[PDB]
Design a protein around this nucleic acid. Structure first.
Lengths: 62, 85, 82, 205, 171
RNA sequence: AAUUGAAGAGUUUGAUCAUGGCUCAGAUUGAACGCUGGCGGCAGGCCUAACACAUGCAAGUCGAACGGUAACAGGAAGAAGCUUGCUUCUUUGCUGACGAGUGGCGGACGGGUGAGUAAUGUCUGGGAAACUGCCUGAUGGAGGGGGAUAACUACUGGAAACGGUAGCUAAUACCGCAUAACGUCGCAAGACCAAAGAGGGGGACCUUCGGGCCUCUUGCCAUCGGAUGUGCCCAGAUGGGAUUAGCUAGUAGGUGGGGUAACGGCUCACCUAGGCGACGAUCCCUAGCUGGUCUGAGAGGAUGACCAGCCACACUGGAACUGAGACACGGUCCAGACUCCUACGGGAGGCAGCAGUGGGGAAUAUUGCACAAUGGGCGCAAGCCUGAUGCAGCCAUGCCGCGUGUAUGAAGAAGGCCUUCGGGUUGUAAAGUACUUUCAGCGGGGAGGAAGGGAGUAAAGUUAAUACCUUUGCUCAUUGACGUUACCCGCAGAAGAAGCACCGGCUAACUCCGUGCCAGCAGCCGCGGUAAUACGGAGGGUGCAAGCGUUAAUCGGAAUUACUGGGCGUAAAGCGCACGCAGGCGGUUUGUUAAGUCAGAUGUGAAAUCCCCGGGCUCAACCUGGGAACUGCAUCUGAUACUGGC
């Protein structure tokens, strides 16, 4: 199944591995799923400081 | 199987054998009377019956042919032996 | 073999027993015939902590029921007629 | 679980005195009260039925120091208890140990009242009580620790404590630093901008 | 059986045993022997088998309470570093498809000279350390601790943040 | 006193009303993932592969059953370590005891799992054709002999596992005989059936002075019971599917042998030709059932992890044996798949017991302690066994508490942010000043779970008896895993401890800049193509807090399967029309019946949970006393308008 990659930029490539989350996006029909960022082979969005839980970024050294 | 109760198994084997013998003899002792009934000789029947009755009740008290199983055997014998004879 | 024994219902570190008639072959907290009285190993000292229906107990005993050591160690501990 | 933040910040948003700063001088001000709760606080927030229906209970909390997960339970209790669920809820809130403390004026604010109760500076009928949530029955008697009695804090607290509205349902002392909860406070002998019908209304659906 | 001096006995390590762990019947004392030196480096096993993921990791956090190598897992979940007896990083690959892990795994080059060195002492100060230079900071199989630096100068400045503790290798 | 509690909002249109779906706010979880993470109480923890398992343990116990000595222990006719008085030796099983064996009992409990099972199951209520170890009530019995056999010994094949031939020996092992009724058979006559001894002792007398004998204690036999547990039977109910409409030869019934503990086609023979089914059989799919659990105002919907009852399985399939009870998880036999040891000729095994490993998966724990308590098996008892149980470990997984400071503090700093530059804001927030130290860290003191058991004393206890045994008081020494326990008191010092989501509308909460239909957000509607409250960052704010978010899933809202509670002229929807079997419904009056209906009673509806009022852990969660409730079923006696039968 096809799945959506949130945020700006991702490390994903040919094989890798991800964790598919779910929930759809109605822009691109047929995509009923999301890939959880920062899970498994997925790297979290670089530099993301806000709502980092989603998009999977750790505290940038408060 | 590496538990000391396998001696319980060999024990029960012995038991088994013994019982098989006793029971066997008992049943043959009844078959005498049955043969006596099919052959139809009333005297011979009565004889056979009197021969088995103690051997039955005995095994009853010994706990193989238990209890009223004995009763059955004798009863349904008697109801037969003098029915046509 | 009917037995009047103790079942441990209470809580961690704070047990609350229950004296009960049951088949000996059963589990501690398992099937039983009826509940007779109870026992509290804590209770502090205030108003309470043990109750038994003695007239029932003796009925069962007389119906040929055995009693657990702790159980009788209750039964005579509460005395009898006083 | 404790708030730990600016108190006047909450006072200005709720738009009334939440008795957080009580201490030496009371009746707020010196904060620019109500005119700048936020950076945009000069705004004229016309608010929804929902909005006020929130602001009510959300004030009732801040005026005590209880948080939501507890507050909810409180409400449930009140609902279960026969009689007006609003005034029952208030009863429960007023039955809190920390509350009974600030009320008996053993501490400046309810915030200060907590420090003691948690620091084992008080007791019930003579067993010491650590928990701030303790529900105070009638006839129960709260007393400052014999060990630490009359300190640089509680002494100055009793001062304006005597100078407050003062309660009815409880009987206080000075040198004994102990008091009795005589009866559960009636709806009539306590009141404020607080509305019960707004808060009971909030938890329905 | 039961053993006498000079024999060699085996136990059952569950993060309780290390290297040079002295066992007595009571006498609190520790044998002054046992070498235990520090690793060089390189690596980044990034795995074929496109994951899992434990079996690789589990494999690595099980060849590591052994004395040869030891892994290094930074605070980015992925990016697995291993370090590094001498240069025989091959038994790793081989025990990555023997022992009890059906992984495969390969390598790369990694911007790490040190090694590192694994720190801890007094509180608060450490929490300011485990924050400022955290970029940059790692955690090991065994649940602690370590840094991971780019060179020698960037190693000195790190310690120079100071004054909280070694050096520490401990295998 | 003990069920008295019901909210709506967004989106079809230029707009409107109605229809109708989608979506949102709630509650819930054995959850997972992301970011984060300080305590403690209690509980929870393979939901996936009933997939495969290295290693330890999970069932043994009685010498007051027997032959007995292989070990430690006391003492011995004699020598002695010899320190002539204590100790040391050859043997010695005489005593305590006890390896191996025989026998007795337990291994059918306890623990695991949900595979199979749409009814040999379960739940509810009745019933007739049975059995029941250990514990019990009652009445009597226990007389006298016999033949074997492990162990052991002599050979002997074995790598091991295991044995194989011959001979000897005991018993509460096994077998006759005697004795037999309140028992079985038989209408009666009369026939026929049993058993076991072993201990602690002790006045007579004592005989062949083994001990006979007296006695209490324990155990055996027979019959009738009590209690318990287990069979068996009937009805009602307990998923979906008609794109499954017919199923069935021992099938349905009878008669008669046989059989079982017991009825029975359970089996066999013969004889009738039935039996089931749309009130859904049959066949497929799925599934353990219940008490209950989550949701719901309720009616319901969903669900049956943890806890308790019932069932079933214990490598796959099959079968018996022993025994009260098994067709038997840690028994046996056979077959099947696999695996392991082998000196190659041959053997051995099954974690869905505890813990653990691999595998699978988004994901689910320590190869811990102790039998001190509770409870179970053996024993007269002490006692022995006991991953049952009691505890401990790990994990924010959940619920419930608590802390991460409390007071004071300025035209209100710096900095960050907006600014029409006049200032506003972050903000009493910080600093500073006073103050308190729970919880953690260190150090001291120290409850409760403990009750019994082990040695001595007294009881018109019984006795020939002060011994023995039992009993009840008494005296002494002693009995714990948790355990540096809970809890108490000091020491130090704000000292060690806040994060996550959100701010266009539903929806509490705002601006700057950047970007520019790019990058990107979105649960729905919907944002972004040059001033974005919607993207990304920043300031600020709002909401929760050791958690916050996201996903997943159940109920709710959804009167959106509408019994309570909906619809069909045009929105989805009246068969194209008619006849008509089954089924549903039926004018009116009397008599009768009294099933439905209704009233009263009596059983029953396990405990736990829910609810009510109390009680105990500092409060709570948790624990617990009592009561209601279990809305149901059945039987009996009444009422009779309506309903049904006559």
């Amino acid at each position: 199944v096809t799945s959506y990659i949130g945020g700006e930029g991702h490390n994903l490539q040919e094989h890798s591995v991800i964790l598919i989350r779910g929930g759809r996006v109605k822009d691109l029909p047929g995509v009923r799923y999301h890939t959880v960022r920062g899970a498994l082979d997925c790297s979290g969005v670089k530099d993301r400081k806000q709502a980092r839980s989603k998009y999977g970024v750790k505290r940038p050294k408060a | 199987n590496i538990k000391s109760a396998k001696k319980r198994a060999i024990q029960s084997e012995k038991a088994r054998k013994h019982n098989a013998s006793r029971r066997s003899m008992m049943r043959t002792f009844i078959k005498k009377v049955y043969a006596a009934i099919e052959a139809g000789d009333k005297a011979a029947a009565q004889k056979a019956f009197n021969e088995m009755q103690p051997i039955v009740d005995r095994q009853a008290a010994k706990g193989l042919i238990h209890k009223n199983k004995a009763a059955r055997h004798k009863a349904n014998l008697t109801a037969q032996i003098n029915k046509l004879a | 073999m009917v037995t009047i024994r103790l079942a441990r219902h209470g809580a961690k570190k704070r047990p609350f027993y229950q004296v009960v008639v049951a088949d000996s072959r059963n589990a501690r907290n398992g099937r039983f015939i009826e509940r007779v009285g109870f026992f509290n190993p804590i209770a502090s000292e205030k108003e309470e902590g043990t109750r038994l229906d003695l007239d029932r107990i003796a009925h069962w005993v007389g119906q040929g029921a055995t009693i657990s050591d702790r159980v009788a160690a209750l039964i005579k501990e509460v005395n009898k007629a006083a | 679980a404790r708030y730990l933040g600016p108190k006047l910040k909450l006072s200005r948003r709720e738009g009334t005195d939440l008795f957080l700063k009580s201490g030496v001088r009371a009746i707020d001000t010196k904060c620019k009260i109500e005119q700048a709760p936020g950076q945009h606080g000069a705004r004229k927030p016309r608010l929804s039925d929902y909005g006020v229906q929130l602001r009510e209970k959300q004030k009732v909390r801040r005026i005590y120091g209880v948080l939501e997960r507890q507050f909810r339970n409180y409400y449930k209790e009140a609902a279960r208890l026969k009689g007006n669920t609003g005034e029952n809820l208030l009863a429960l809130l007023e039955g809190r140990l920390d509350n009974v403390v600030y009320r008996m004026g053993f501490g400046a604010t309810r915030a200060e009242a907590r420090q003691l109760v948690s620091h084992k500076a008080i007791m019930v009928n003579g067993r010491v009580v650590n928990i701030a949530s303790y529900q105070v029955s009638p006839n129960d008697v709260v007393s400052i620790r014999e060990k630490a009695k009359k300190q640089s804090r509680v002494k100055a607290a009793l001062e304006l404590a005597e100078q407050r509205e003062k309660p009815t349902w409880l009987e206080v002392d000075a040198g004994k630093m102990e008091g009795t909860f005589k009866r559960k406070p009636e709806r009539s002998d306590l009141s404020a901008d607080i509305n019960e019908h707004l808060i009971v209304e909030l938890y329905s659906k | 059986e039961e053993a006498y001096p000079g024999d060699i006995l085996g136990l059952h390590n569950h993060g309780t045993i290390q290297i040079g762990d002295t066992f007595t019947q009571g006498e609190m004392m520790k044998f002054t022997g046992i070498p235990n030196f520090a690793p060089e480096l390189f690596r980044r096993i990034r795995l074929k088998d496109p994951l899992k993921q434990k079996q690789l990791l589990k494999g690595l956090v099980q060849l590591s309470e052994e004395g040869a190598v030891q892994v290094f897992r930074p605070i980015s979940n992925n990016d697995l570093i291993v370090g590094a007896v001498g240069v025989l990083q091959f038994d790793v690959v081989v025990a990555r498809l023997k022992s009890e892990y059906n992984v495969e795994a390969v390598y790369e080059s990694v911007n790490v000279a040190t090694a590192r060195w694994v720190e801890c002492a007094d509180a608060k100060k450490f929490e300011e350390f485990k924050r400022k230079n955290e970029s940059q900071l790692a955690l090991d199989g065994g649940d602690n601790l370590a840094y991971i630096a780019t060179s020698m100068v960037n190693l000195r400045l790190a310690q120079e943040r100071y004054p909280d503790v070694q050096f520490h290798q401990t295998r």
